[PDB]
Amino acid sequence: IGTYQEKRTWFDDADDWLRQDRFVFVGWSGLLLFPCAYFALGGWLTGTTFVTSWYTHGLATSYLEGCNFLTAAVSTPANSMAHSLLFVWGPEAQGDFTRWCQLGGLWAFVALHGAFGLIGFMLRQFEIARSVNLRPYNAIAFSAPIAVFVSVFLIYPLGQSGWFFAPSFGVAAIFRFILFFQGFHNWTLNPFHMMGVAGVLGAALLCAIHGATVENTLFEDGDGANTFRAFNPTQAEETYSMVTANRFWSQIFGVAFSNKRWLHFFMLLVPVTGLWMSAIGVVGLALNLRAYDFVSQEIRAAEDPEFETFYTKNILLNEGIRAWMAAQDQPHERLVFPEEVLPRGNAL
Amino acid sequence: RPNPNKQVVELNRTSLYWGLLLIFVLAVLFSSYIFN
């Protein structure tokens, strides 16, 4: 059936069945995407619904214990496990299930199955693009979320002392992670995070302007005020005036797009670059390579007691966060800070 | 023997402006950290 018109085998029949068009496109990558993603979602839900974190973190995080949607999470394993893969059949759990769920292995289960689900999803995007005969720019775009997930949930915990310092799958847990980076890593001051936030805000800006400009430069292709109905999806004529939009934005802003392909490629390119740079910054953080302090200003402040800048105030705030949060954030250190050593504004 | 695979690179004024803006913005962002 191929180039040389040869016979058909098991692989041919499997390929014909898998790629058959239906409501739910399975594809070859479906065998990987569907079970992994299904078990990731199931693990997250059954963990945030029944499983607790009393023994791993000393916290109560579940619906059964009385937490709502915002303060429920699947917490990471205890710091004692370090970087253990923590299989249900592993030496830690010895095959037991209730101990395994009680020991924090459900986080590792969810994270690993979700990562493989992401891989399967990108493979599915590739398969769909090949089937429809289109350039697979969607997979190139989706590369950035995978990079962010790998940097934050896998590479960073591996660089640290264990899975304990990974983000936990929950809203309040993510907020804790964010504040932890602020207090300890000075993550706001890292230039890579600056480039990432610039990219994300620029992507939102581009989306807003493109939508408004397209919707405010339509051609009068029909009667009535409801312009949405005046559009035929099979038409071969442009639905908005590129020349008018170009002139308007060149006279308002100063520079305006003149190529549709370049415009949409720029929309694709900005956020992908932003999150890739954020991922590189997080990779740098994983090894404690922090853009924490400016040596010149620190020396000047130490020498001159009258020297104050917003940078020094941020340093003081970070020190306060660290000292007041590490007491309960990291139980395995067994830190007991006397009330007289905690940093505190003396004014009271 | 002359090579059939011969091509010329082009860079319109918009690309030049984009590149200059990119390098100057990167220098502005990273100068504070490089000087420390």
């Binding site: 170009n246 520079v255 003149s258 | 402006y17 200059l20 803006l21 100057f24 913005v25 100068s31």
Partner: peptide, 30 residues
């Protein structure tokens, strides 16, 4: 010294912005 470098960088960026706004390639066949 470093303040002069920062000022030069900012002035150069502003000059590039001005040139891009004004001395632009005229768009044809939009």
């Amino acid at each position: 010294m470093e303040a002069l470098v920062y000022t030069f960088l900012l002035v150069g960026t502003l000059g590039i912005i001005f040139f891009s706004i004004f001395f632009r390639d005229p768009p044809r066949m939009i």
